[PDB]
Nucleic acid binder design. Structure first.
Ligand SMILES: Nc1ccn([C@H]2C[C@H](O)[C@@H](COP(=O)(O)OP(=O)(O)OP(=O)(O)O)O2)c(=O)n1
Ligand SMILES: [Ca+2]
Ligand SMILES: [Ca+2]
Ligand SMILES: [Ca+2]
Ligand SMILES: [Ca+2]
Length: 341
DNA sequence: GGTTGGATGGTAG
DNA sequence: AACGCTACCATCCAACC
């Protein structure tokens, strides 16, 4: 089984470079402006010339500007980056019927029937990289291994425009040598818990009682790691389907006044519905993000599709429920649509 | 005890 | 001196058979 994984390099930044070639070289920071006050926001991403200097995703713009005050700060334009993504994904289908679009800039390709061995995959990888640079002038990174996880890990190791193979031996090496914290699916909480149990490599999940691991990190993460560590992880490449469409927005100021939060909720509803486009949801959720940045939601599932007017009623009924059941001030409000017909 | 849906939690783009 | 947003799957807990 041979999986080729494709991840696009500093994608949003790079799309802007392509669209405005004058940007080439200069440090570019793609931003999300919450709009609260002038320069309030966070960084979606930055090119390598800014990342170079600590300007990474998630940091506040202000804090980025402290580091690189002369960088080019651009607002996010997801719909553009989306289009470009869409075109690249279509380019990738010329290489495999079995293709799993993972996110806005990742795809796993099951090439097991398309090449004999890793040499040929490597050659196919080079070919794909050129085809993308050819059509869309985006540079990407290709990771190759025996399953999805190690394909991705391969690409992490190659990242800034590259192609890496992980043969059967190197998989075994990384089971012993690779930091478990750097295993796709393991975020800081789990890494903390695992290190708090004394596990820093994949191998030492085979040294513990299964019910002990199952106790800390939950059943799934346990059964996951073990499956990897046993050189056994083999989850198939499968078409993914958008399961929800929604939108949440930062209010100008925290509020608990229903009438003050409403327009923000409705702006979100109108934007969600616009993004639904033929897709009819039977479930709605109002999502509130509180003062202290915690997430609170109440939803409802109908035996039918939800009309625009029904969203208008129910989102209000549900926001009212958040205000009754939670004392905190609300900072962000939004809506989330799901369970499609 | 197993399934199910609602709420939350964790993860990664 | 303050700090975005989208969305996936798993878990938790309680109703229910
Ligand atoms: N917290 C994040 C993480 C990612 N993204 C968006 C912008 C990224 O460019 C894209 C893909 O995430 P990546 O981690 O792959 O980031 P990059 O593509 O920019 O960098 P890299 O070259 O490492 O792939 O998703 C974002 O909105 N916010
Ligand atoms: Ca990635
Ligand atoms: Ca990327
Ligand atoms: Ca990690
Ligand atoms: Ca219930």
């Amino acid at each position: 089984g041979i999986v080729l994984f494709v991840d696009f390099d500093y994608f949003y930044a790079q799309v802007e470079e392509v669209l405005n070639p004058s940007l080439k070289g200069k440090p570019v920071v793609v931003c999300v402006f919450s709009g609260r006050f002038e320069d309030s926001g966070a960084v979606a991403t930055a090119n390598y010339e800014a990342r170079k200097f600590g300007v990474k995703a998630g940091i506040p713009i202000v804090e980025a500007k402290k580091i690189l005050p002369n960088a080019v700060y651009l607002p996010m334009r997801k719909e553009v980056y989306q289009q470009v993504s869409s075109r690249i994904m279509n380019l990738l289908r010329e290489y495999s019927e079995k293709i799993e679009i993972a996110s806005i800039d990742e795809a796993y390709l099951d090439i097991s029937d398309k090449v004999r061995d890793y040499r040929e995959a490597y050659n196919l990888g080079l070919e794909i990289k050129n085809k993308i640079l050819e059509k869309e002038k985006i540079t990407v990174t290709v990771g190759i291994s025996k399953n999805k996880v190690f394909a991705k890990i391969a690409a992490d190791m190659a990242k800034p425009n590259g192609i890496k193979v992980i043969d059967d031996e190197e998989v075994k090496r990384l089971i012993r040598e690779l930091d478990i914290a750097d295993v796709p699916g393991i975020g800081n909480i789990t890494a903390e818990k695992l290190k708090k149990l004394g596990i820093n490599k994949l191998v030492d999940t085979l040294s513990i009682e299964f019910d002990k691991l199952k106790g800390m990190i939950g059943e799934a993460k346990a059964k996951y790691l073990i499956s990897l560590a046993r050189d056994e992880y083999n989850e198939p490449i499968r078409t993914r389907v958008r399961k929800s469409i929604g939108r949440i927005v930062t209010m100008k100021r925290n509020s608990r006044n229903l009438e003050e939060i409403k327009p923000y909720l409705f702006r979100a509803i109108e934007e969600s519905y616009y993004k639904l486009d033929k897709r009819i949801p039977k479930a709605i959720h109002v999502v509130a993000v509180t003062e202290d940045l915690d997430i609170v939601s109440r939803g409802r599932t109908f035996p039918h599709g939800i009309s625009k007017e029904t969203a208008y009623s129910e989102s209000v009924k549900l926001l009212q429920k958040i205000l009754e059941e939670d004392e905190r001030k609300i900072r962000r409000i939004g809506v989330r649509f799901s369970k499609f017909i």
